[PDB]
Amino acid sequence: EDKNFPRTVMVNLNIHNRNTNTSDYYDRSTSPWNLHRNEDPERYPSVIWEAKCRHLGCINADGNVDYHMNSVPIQQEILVLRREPPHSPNSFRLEKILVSVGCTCVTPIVHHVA
Amino acid sequence: RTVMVNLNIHNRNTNTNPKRSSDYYDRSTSPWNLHRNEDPERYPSVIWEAKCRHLGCINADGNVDYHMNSVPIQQEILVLRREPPHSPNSFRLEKILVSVGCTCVTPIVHH
Amino acid sequence: EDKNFPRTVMVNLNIHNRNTNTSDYYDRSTSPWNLHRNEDPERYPSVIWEAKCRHLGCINADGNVDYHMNSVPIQQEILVLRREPPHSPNSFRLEKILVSVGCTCVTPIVHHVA
Amino acid sequence: RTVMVNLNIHNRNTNTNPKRSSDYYDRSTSPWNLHRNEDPERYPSVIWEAKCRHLGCINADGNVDYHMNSVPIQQEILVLRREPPHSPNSFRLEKILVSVGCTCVTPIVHH
Amino acid sequence: LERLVGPQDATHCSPGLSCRLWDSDILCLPGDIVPAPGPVLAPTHLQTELVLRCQKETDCDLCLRVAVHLAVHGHNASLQAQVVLSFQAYPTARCVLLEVQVPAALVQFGQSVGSVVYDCFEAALGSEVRIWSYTQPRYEKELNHTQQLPDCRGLEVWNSIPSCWALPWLNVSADGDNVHLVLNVSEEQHFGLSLYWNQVQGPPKPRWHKNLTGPQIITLNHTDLVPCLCIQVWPLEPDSVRTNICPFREDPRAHQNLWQAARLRLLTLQSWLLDAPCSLPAEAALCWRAPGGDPCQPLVPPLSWENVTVDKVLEFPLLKGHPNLCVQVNSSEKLQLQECLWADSLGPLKDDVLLLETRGPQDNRSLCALEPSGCTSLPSKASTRAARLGEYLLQDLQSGQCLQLWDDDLGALWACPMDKYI
Amino acid sequence: LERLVGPQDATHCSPGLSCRLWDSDILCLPGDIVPAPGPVLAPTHLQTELVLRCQKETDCDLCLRVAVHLAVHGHNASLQAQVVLSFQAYPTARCVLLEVQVPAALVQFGQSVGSVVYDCFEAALGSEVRIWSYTQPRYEKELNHTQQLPDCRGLEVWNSIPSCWALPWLNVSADGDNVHLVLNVSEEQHFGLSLYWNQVQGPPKPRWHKNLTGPQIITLNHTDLVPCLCIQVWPLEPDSVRTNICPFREDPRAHQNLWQAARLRLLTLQSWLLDAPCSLPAEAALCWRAPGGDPCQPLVPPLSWENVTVDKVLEFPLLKGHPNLCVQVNSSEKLQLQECLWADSLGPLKDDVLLLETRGPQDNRSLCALEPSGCTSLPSKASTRAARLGEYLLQDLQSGQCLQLWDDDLGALWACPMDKYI
Amino acid sequence: LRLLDHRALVCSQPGLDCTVKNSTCLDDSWIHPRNLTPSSPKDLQIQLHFAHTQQGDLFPVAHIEWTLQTDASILYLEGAELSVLQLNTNERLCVRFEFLSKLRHHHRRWRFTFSHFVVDPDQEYEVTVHHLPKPIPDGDPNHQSKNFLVPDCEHARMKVTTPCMSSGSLWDPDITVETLEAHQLRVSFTLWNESTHYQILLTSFPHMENHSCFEHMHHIPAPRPEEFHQRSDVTLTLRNLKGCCRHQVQIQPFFSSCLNDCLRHSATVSCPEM
Amino acid sequence: LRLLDHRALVCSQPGLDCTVKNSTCLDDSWIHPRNLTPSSPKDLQIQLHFAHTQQGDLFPVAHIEWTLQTDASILYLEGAELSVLQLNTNERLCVRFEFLSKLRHHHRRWRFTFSHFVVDPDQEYEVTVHHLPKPIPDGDPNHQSKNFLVPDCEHARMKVTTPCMSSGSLWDPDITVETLEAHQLRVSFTLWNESTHYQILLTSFPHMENHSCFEHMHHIPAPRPEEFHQRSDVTLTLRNLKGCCRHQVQIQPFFSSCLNDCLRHSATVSCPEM
């Protein structure tokens, strides 16, 4: 019932493409990463690309694992819809979730004493 | 043609893991700067877009190696928007392509 | 009668000295000026020092009138009280007036054509 | 101990003479800079104080002649102030010594 | 039908039946296996045709065209239905909204009702896409058609995609004493330029690197030009593709510069090396230079031409060195180097005669002297009228005076002193 | 009573009667001549005593003390009254509020009732002040007592005011080969310093000018030091007073430097000048320098010592110039200059003898020759045994050979050539 | 500082009932304030203009405009003091807006314009807009100030205005001065249609130094009505001592519209070698 | 980003009835706005602090404070969204203030404080304070944003907090390394009271060049409970070829509180000539 909880609102359904209609970086990066199937038919989007750092260090020009650098993950908070009630394709409820998007290579923290 | 949504959010990222990150934008081999994407018509109102500072990566000495490339990690995320009062709908769900961070990659060579 | 015109207000009478208790410049200036008695028992203060430029040009180090420079007056708008009704030392009415305070020497405006 | 005043001002400087001045603070032999003395408790709220930029005057070439002196023309003017609500009076008349302009003078010499 | 579809997004089903498309990336999810209280449509299989899109003449991209066949099943005469194509594939995520309306004529229970075609699913090269097709509302589970796409490796892929080889033209120009790099980039097009010397280990060896705003015709210096010189160009955009062109591999002027820059250096008495920028294999052998004149006579026979390789260390089969011994390096037999290694170690050139020993008939020793005109087998009659000064050198040799330079089971070389005859 | 009143503002009337002060610069204006329905006070005359104020030991200013005598007039036994003193005078504008309360004992109709005294009206030196005293409310018109004040010219004014002469001390120090300017300003006190050469026209002639943060003991250069050197100092505050001290007027080292810098220059044959920085009058005369030696014999007699002044052009009483004629300048007879003017115009020095003519007894001509040991009246017996070469010069003179240098009714000078005798 | 004209200066615009009362620059709310306090005027801006008056004269005028904040305080708004305080003289100028109907609804950003303030060229002003009722003492300000400034007559659109033409901007002398061989200088110039005295000013210097060698003035009394636009030749002798030669002159005009302050028209000719 | 504790976080202060409700960071007014619009929060400011919790642990906490505008809009004020958006992760944190009694009188500048937000050291945040009801679309903002930032553990008052001590700030290795004459290097260091692996990292270079000559790693598995604080000597051979000599080592720790990101403790000894 609407008006019982004012948090229930109508949504257009036809997504407004913010030029999403108008990569191979995971394997080419010096801090590469692998994608995992964090899939769920109840959550929108159904398929997710969980990216966690493949190498602990960073790969140099020769292909060696260079321990003078560290690969670090990049996480974000994104909004998703989850069915409410379950299996009913008419209504949903918002959710904020943690996702691992990609990796980058960083110089370590050092404390130089003579 | 229209779907109902309960905006009573459930915060699922309340894990607060032991690992607590530091300012990576300057420590990275591919540095980046962040832009305040603020829009009160959209929720979340504020989104911080990270964009690569240099075309190349930083070598051990501390210079831009033009033989390597810094690339932004662009992520499509779900965001809400207040659809005009005249239009039939009050809210419209939109997909936005935004820059999250940067990473150093080897460039491609076509023989 | 008070309240007929809300513009009637009480005033402390004992002036708050903004360090006025804590010059010969008119004769020493390169653009000297003379003082005139613009006095009036109805206006506060009663005595005034109207200063208007004595020399059209400016006096140089030798004492000559140098026509390559101009003496200009400095005027200001100040508030004063005038008796209302006349000769009654109980009530007054505000007034904004023009006063010539002092002079200064300025370079003339020039349009150089070859 | 107290005097009544009608603040219905009569603007007597409405002469608007033919002579219309120009920016003298830079043209003068004794240049000056102006400070915004703003106070909402006092009427007039804003008063522009001119204070000499240099100790000496400007020679024909365009340099500070330290053998001459720039002096401010200080004028005492009448101003009103909103006396606190707790104090018996609502308004208090004050005399303020403020810098109006500057002029070039010959310094004094004691033999 | 065609492999050159237009820039617009529109549907075109099989003849007879009418249909429409709402390409608004609608929210799509499975939901539940609902009941069918009447004739309802359902998919049978998925297809993936090779189609290309071109917005303008100089701008073309891919279009993985998909098709879904439908059929009547379940428990007005026009049968209506709503179909979806959830393309949850990498990199971008987008959905499609079809609207099939098969009329009464094609209505057959337990049989097909035509097909629907969407143009297009622009997928990147080298990404195993996921095509999940299901009815709206859902009846059958999403049909799996996980298509494997070719990278820039398909035969037809090279014929159309500009990423494959087509990069701003750098024309080869070894004209005159100036080697020109003619560029065909636009006036406002910026680019990165790098020139280097490739080889076996440690491929990168840059000589010049710079950012430029072309088209600039860059004239190269013959100091940095050799067969190893390779060029790499790329537009000033992140992740832009480059190409490594190594054309000087068989250029005459490049090989001429290579040899004039190459040098020979003695490491130790029994070790030497060929130091050249470009590592190109070639042969070499020991030679005997006369002190008076300079017609260097090769010592082949009896010595052998060694298989030399640049940066590969070689050893001499000599007991000791001699200033008259000089190494000769040739590529395709044409002589390139004649540097005398022992000119600093034991030089200058000594006028000590060289002998070539070999076992003559009847097991006896048979000697010979290296003269400007070949060799003269001595003891023998001489051009000096007498039995030659070789008669006395013959005594010096058997009395242990001569210096043995090379030793072999079949022969030997000797440096005999002639400083007691003139 | 005292000429050294305190820093506080308070009233002190004559004995017996009590009184108070509200020194709040009250709003004061005449108003109107109101009626007196009873005994009311009124002023008779105004007074102006010499009083000084001192807040601390090193800080003193003026206090023009004023007094007003009152009296009962007009149409409890304690007679009360309110008095005002509107000091509408230049530069500042301030009013005063007294409160006289003369008790019953001093109440006399048509007679005085004591006096009231305010401390103080701080007025600037050299400003004819305006003292306008009237009752509150007004009865009598404001009494005129327009007091004329002395500038920094009163005898007692100099004894107390620091503006009058007392300026940071610069002690004179002409000790050794270094002239020191010892300064006594505080470490944080900033000041302007200027040194110049004063004279008759165009007084300013600066040699050094600079801003400093004292106390710095500045050592002067003897190049810029002469009796005209004057110092001027002033603190770095606008309108600050300065002082011009010229002590080198009679310093021995300054006059020594003055003469070594002064120079003599010939303008034309009949005009010359003394070029000196400091214009100090002194005398000069023509001299005769020998070519061999240098004992310059003055030509006095017969010529006169001229009154010379620096920068004042002088003329020679000579028909023509001679290289042996040199000008000698002395001040107090001590010789300073002996520069030979015609050393460039007709030099070098010629060994032509000079003669001194004068009318001898019996109207005849009597000549004499300038020798190192005075003059020798010739024709005469000579130290050369014969009648001298003067016998032959006597002929050269009357035969018009000799050059007439000076002409007079009583005598004449002649340059005779001796280049035909050695 | 003055109004363009005491005419129908009324602020009654659509969706707004009000009137612009000319005030003494001291609203009643300054004297006796209220607990309420309206919002500040957001994005205040001023722009100069030139409006031809009824007489036919053109004058430099200040066009002021601003937008109100969309907060609830916009309801409790009586009006505004459009103050234009000149800094050279501290002279106060202003107009009091007074609303009949109190503002409601919002929807569009409310805006007000004021094209009725004559300004003196080459003067710095401070245009403050004090919303009413004025705030309480020890209270937040509901005003915005802007240091407005008018350019000099050398600007093309200023020279044409009335204050510039009377000062002597249109006037061009055309100094037909001649180096007479008799050690004299033939000064000459055309004068403007206004009866006033003009004074020639000579100064001489060497060809390689800024220091002067001689000075001289020559007066020219007020020309007659027929003598307007006439050429005034006033030849003067030069004490040309060998060494000095670079003569320099400036005709200093003394029109009523300025006096000594006026625009001097200079002319210079260097030492001719050869 | 997290609350210090879900305790009596209530805003009921003198002359003010209200309560601080923990919210989803999306007030009802964002969804369905009102014609009214409160003022912006003037002079917003944040200051870091350290409050000891019930457990006894000390944490870095953000103390937020601000003052309301004295305009009439202060009456029509429901509350505020104290948002603390982290920029590295865009994670949204906030609390919804809700007034029982609506604000009246003024007289003193109303002020609110919030000492209940744990922050992660060395992270940039944006503390926005959105007054309620939120404004309408195409409406003025009633908020102020401030880019807050927490300093690194090298700061004295940060090193003492809980997040720094577990990361490995207190820990000091005391690298008693020795240049053994047998062309070997005696690595050694004391370890912290936490079971985790430590890895030694060697790199060598000449005495006059930044370029390296050799690299080598040496693993050290997790020490036992008794082996906490124990000295771990792990000697390694140096392939000291004549030319290279300036050895450089850094013990890279891998604690749970950071992993590869952790604080590396370096030690360097130059080439000894003579």
Ligand SMILES: *[C@@H]1O[C@H](CO)[C@@H](O)[C@H](O)[C@H]1NC(C)=O
């Ligand atoms: C250079 O240009 C000519 C045409 O002028 C063409 O035939 C040739 O193939 C080009 N070479 C390269 C390497 O592009």
Ligand SMILES: *[C@@H]1O[C@H](CO)[C@@H](O)[C@H](O)[C@H]1NC(C)=O
């Ligand atoms: C390269 O540029 C030259 C410029 O003269 C032009 O002649 C040539 O046709 C261009 N070639 C291409 C392929 O653009």
Ligand SMILES: *[C@@H]1O[C@H](CO)[C@@H](O)[C@H](O)[C@H]1NC(C)=O
């Ligand atoms: C080595 O020498 C032989 C001699 O017969 C020749 O055939 C061969 O080509 C040489 N080069 C290499 C690289 O084998």
Ligand SMILES: *[C@@H]1O[C@H](CO)[C@@H](O)[C@H](O)[C@H]1NC(C)=O
């Ligand atoms: C210099 O100082 C001495 C005392 O040391 C004093 O007697 C003398 O008068 C001072 N001279 C001047 C000019 O102040």
Ligand SMILES: *[C@@H]1O[C@H](CO)[C@@H](O)[C@H](O)[C@H]1NC(C)=O
């Ligand atoms: C001047 O300064 C010197 C510093 O040594 C001091 O001895 C002397 O007494 C001072 N004189 C005065 C008058 O301050």
Ligand SMILES: *[C@@H]1O[C@H](CO)[C@@H](O)[C@H](O)[C@H]1NC(C)=O
């Ligand atoms: C001029 O000369 C006479 C000679 O008797 C002398 O008395 C006088 O002092 C000299 N100086 C001046 C300036 O008169």
Ligand SMILES: *[C@@H]1O[C@H](CO)[C@@H](O)[C@H](O)[C@H]1NC(C)=O
């Ligand atoms: C307003 O203007 C009218 C004339 O139009 C005048 O009577 C009135 O006094 C003016 N008031 C002020 C304060 O300027």
Ligand SMILES: *[C@@H]1O[C@H](CO)[C@@H](O)[C@H](O)[C@H]1NC(C)=O
């Ligand atoms: C507020 O905290 C309580 C527990 O103290 C919890 O039940 C509630 O869900 C929380 N709400 C949000 C939105 O954090």
